[PDB]
């Protein structure tokens, strides 16, 4: 009926993106000195989980980190003293995401229960209790994060995104249009835009105030598993099961650089930039994390200290350490 | 050495570690199973294990006790057809009970294809699958009627022979026994194409109304446990 119009629009967009491709990212910055072999060592070894660790998130102080495993218990780990600060027993053992509020007052966690419950840490009752519950989603929550001190972003299993208000606990903003199941979402430093990747080999940019999609980049060939935003606020890297990471710029509106290798055939499970954004870390299904250069696309470092599939990776706000959590219930801090 | 705040933090960490150690006992003592099946696969009747509140809830849990051992069965609720991402979460489960109803042959072969994704999965290649051939009375009535033919959907049934290891119940027609053994073989030809040492299958013949299914579930769990113990000790 109108499929020809959509095909013509796609062809026009492709021709416009091809005409603006003056040079590649690997050609403009090629005379830069190599980063060299970045050898990292383990500084702290966090253990104590009873099931496979699934997700983790660093706070805004580089001292506390929240972790969500498949046992229904949250532990606020301390990277400095290697001790436990809080133990939150959850009502469900099947969780898939976690977050840490910037002020350090609330912690959200969701999963197969379609509810990202938020718990308070500074309660006067002496023990952590249920602070708020957000129900209404028709699918498992893959990414539940804090957008501000009063809003919370969630990616539901029905190919939709929802920005809830903590005060009223109702659907404040909706985002529909995705064809595949959203797996990960990364917020921008200015809390104005956010990119989301779904199971359709494409990522979409959405606004926190407009409520619409403006930039969609396919780029990949398989389901996108992880995503991360560049610290500059204009680019973002994505990873899929095709063992190829791809960088996309919001201003350039085109793919920047592709990281791949013939020896790697396993997909990416977690990805995160550094403080400067030159080193890009990505863990694979072969119990190791590869750190590549954002300007040379060469293998800068390899970190192999896990025995099972890596599930989560997190870089601190200052970049002084990187936490990695696999299904072996072992959190490892590398520097 | 340690200050007051450091001592308080160490004491809190020790208390949390003791609580985790105490919870580990009841975590390892209780087993966890995953109930899977299609819409008309009779999952609503097998999940009724109460004999021992969210409208949009996509996961339900049923707790019961068999031979003093506590079991928790998790059943997926309202979920889309895309089942390639969340299925990786059920990697440490004890067993996967997949309900199969042999009442509509047109929907059987497709289902067999779910068994071959449950079996040829890269991450779920070490988890055993408990096969329950539910609703055998419907298949028996359909075979005794003569309207629907099995050869119209499966040509191998036209040349299949009853094996010597067959043990039918006294009073049952040999035709329904041959049919159920052909179905079991068709399932085994798929369940034996991969693994052979990592995980096995447990076929059974149920009718959605039985008071001894808990015993079979407990026996299968014990078999999986002893197989894991033999594999870990290298004895296997």
């Amino acid at each position: 009926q109108l499929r020809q119009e959509a095909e013509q629009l796609k062809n026009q967009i492709r021709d416009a993106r091809k005409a603006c491709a003056d040079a590649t990212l690997s050609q403009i910055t090629n005379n830069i000195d190599p980063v060299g072999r970045i050898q990292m060592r383990t500084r702290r070894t966090l253990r104590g989980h009873l099931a496979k660790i699934y997700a983790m998130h660093w706070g805004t102080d580089s001292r506390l980190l929240v972790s969500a495993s498949q046992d229904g218990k949250l532990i606020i780990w301390d990277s400095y003293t290697t001790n436990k600060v809080h133990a939150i027993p959850l009502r469900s053992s099947w969780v898939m995401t976690c977050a840490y509020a910037p002020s350090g007052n609330y912690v959200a966690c969701g999963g197969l229960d379609n509810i990202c419950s938020i718990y308070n840490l500074k309660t006067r009752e002496g023990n952590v209790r249920v602070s708020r519950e957000l129900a209404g989603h028709t699918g498992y929550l893959s990414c539940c994060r804090f957008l501000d001190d009063n809003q919370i972003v969630t990616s539901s299993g029905d190919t939709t995104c929802a920005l809830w208000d903590i005060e009223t606990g109702q659907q404040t903003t909706t985002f529909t249009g995705h064809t595949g199941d959203v797996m990960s979402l990364s917020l921008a430093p200015d809390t104005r835009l956010f990119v989301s990747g779904a199971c359709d080999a494409s990522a979409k940019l959405w606004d926190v105030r407009e409520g619409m999609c403006r930039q969609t980049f396919t780029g990949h060939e398989s389901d996108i598993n992880a995503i991360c935003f560049f610290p500059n606020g204009n680019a973002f890297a994505t990873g899929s099961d095709d063992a190829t990471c791809r960088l996309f710029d919001l201003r350039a509106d085109q793919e920047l650089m592709t990281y791949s290798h013939d020896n790697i055939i396993c997909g990416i499970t977690s990805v995160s930039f550094s403080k400067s954004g030159r080193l890009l870390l990505a863990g694979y299904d072969d119990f190791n994390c590869n750190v590549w250069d954002a300007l040379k696309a060469d293998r800068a470092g390899v970190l192999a200290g896990h025995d099972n599939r890596v599930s989560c990776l997190g870089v601190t706000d200052d970049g002084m350490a990187v936490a990695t959590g696999s299904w072996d219930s072992f959190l490892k801090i590398w520097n | 050495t340690l200050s007051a705040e450091d001592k308080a933090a160490v004491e809190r960490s020790k208390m949390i570690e003791k609580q985790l150690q105490k919870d580990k006992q009841v975590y390892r003592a209780t087993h966890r199973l995953l109930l899977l099946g299609a819409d008309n696969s009779g999952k609503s009747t097998i999940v009724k294990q109460m004999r021992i509140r969210v409208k949009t809830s996509g996961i339900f849990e049923t707790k019961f006790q068999v031979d003093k051992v506590n079991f928790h069965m998790f059943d997926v609720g309202a979920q889309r057809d895309e089942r390639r991402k969340w299925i990786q979460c059920f990697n440490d489960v004890t067993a996967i009970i997949f309900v199969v109803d042999s009442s509509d042959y047109n929907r059987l072969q497709e289902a067999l294809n779910d068994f071959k994704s449950i079996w040829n999965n890269r991450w779920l290649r070490t988890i055993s699958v408990i096969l329950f051939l539910n609703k055998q009375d419907l298949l028996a009535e359909k075979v005794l009627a003569g309207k629907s033919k099995i050869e119209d959907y499966f040509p191998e049934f036209a040349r299949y022979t009853t094996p010597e290891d067959a043990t039918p119940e006294p009073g049952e027609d040999p035709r329904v026994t041959r049919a159920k053994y052909f179905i079991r073989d068709e399932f085994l030809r798929i369940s034996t194409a991969s693994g052979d040492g990592r995980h096995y299958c447990y076929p059974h013949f149920t009718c959605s109304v039985d008071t001894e299914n808990a015993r079979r579930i407990f026996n299968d769990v014990t078999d999986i446990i002893i197989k894991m113990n033999l594999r870990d000790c290298g004895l296997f």
Partner: nanobody, 125 residues
Framework: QVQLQESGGGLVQPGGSLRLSCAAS????????MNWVRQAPGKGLEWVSD????????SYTGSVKGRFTISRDNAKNTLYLQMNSLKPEDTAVYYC?????????????????????RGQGTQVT
């Protein structure tokens, strides 16, 4: 961009033969398992054929074994499906899907309602 285009449909008579051709672009055609399914009016999706990357692992359903055949060309990245002895009940919409994860044997969501890596299919009467 991943795009699969199928062709070969037409007003065929019961008992003839049809050579359907599917061409994929935007990904490594030789590193993903392929599947062909059918959908009848008023019914659901039914798995018909499955072929691996190299082609040594080919599987069919009950009413296809010995009747239809499938071939794969990696030099041109094409998937051909030759259907002989067409029955009056073969009038359906055929779809071609790819494996979501590379270098994997399992194939999930082959009969899913919403699949972003599947073509529009072709009608066969």
């Amino acid at each position: 961009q991943v795009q699969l285009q199928e062709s070969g449909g037409g007003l065929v008579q019961p008992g003839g033969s049809l050579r359907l051709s599917c061409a994929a672009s935007g990904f490594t055609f030789s590193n993903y398992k392929m599947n062909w399914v059918r959908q009848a009016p008023g019914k659901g999706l039914e798995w018909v054929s499955d072929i691996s990357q190299s082609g040594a692992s080919i599987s069919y359903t009950g009413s296809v074994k010995g009747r239809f055949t499938i071939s794969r060309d990696n030099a041109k990245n094409t998937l051909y499906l030759q259907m002989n002895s067409l029955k009056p009940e073969d009038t359906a919409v055929y779809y071609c899907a790819r494996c979501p994860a590379p270098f994997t044997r399992d194939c999930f969501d082959v009969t899913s309602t919403t699949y972003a890596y599947r073509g529009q299919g072709t009608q066969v009467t």
